């Protein structure tokens, strides 16, 4: 079903110009690379919105665009509509997403 929802994910930059690739509940894989993280509204942050007028979960991946992919522990993660935050992490955090509107 689903009408027309959207998934907002905030990514913490970063590198230089990394690209993100996501798709609807295992449906179609947008033109790789998906889309270039859209800067947020904070300062130095990134944000992207994906519609899912039928999908309740969408997967997104992170790649520098140079054979530098950063899936997770298999392929990717499942994200739902609302507010989410994508963080690659450096410490003992291998690809993690935190729900809730981020603030700095």
From Swiss-Prot:
Highest taxon of source: Bacteria
Sequence repeats: 1-104
Localization annotation: Secreted
Function in brief: The precursor protein is proteolytically cleaved to produce multiform beta-amylases and a 48 kDa alpha-amylase after secretion.
Family indicated by similarity: In the N-terminal section; belongs to the glycosyl hydrolase 14 family.
Record protein name field: Beta/alpha-amylase
